[PDB]
């Protein structure tokens, strides 16, 4: 799990940050 940890931590960072960023710019676009 030397680099399996890399890919797991990477996706665990990526999926919620992209999700939250998408819905945030949905909020901020409408004033």
């Amino acid at each position: 799990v030397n680099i399996l940890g890399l890919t797991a931590t990477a996706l665990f960072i990526i999926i919620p940050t992209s999700f939250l960023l998408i819905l945030y710019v949905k909020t901020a676009a409408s004033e």
């Binding site: 030397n2 680099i3 940890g5 890399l6 931590t9 960072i13």
Partner: peptide
């Protein structure tokens, strides 16, 4: 390899602390 990941993610954590401190949503008095 692990030290790079630890350092990068921790400096990202403190950078987003900085972002939430200074670049926050300004509240309104209305």
């Amino acid at each position: 390899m692990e030290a790079l990941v630890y350092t990068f993610l921790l400096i990202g954590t403190l950078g987003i602390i900085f972002f939430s401190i200074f670049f926050r949503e300004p509240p309104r008095i209305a």
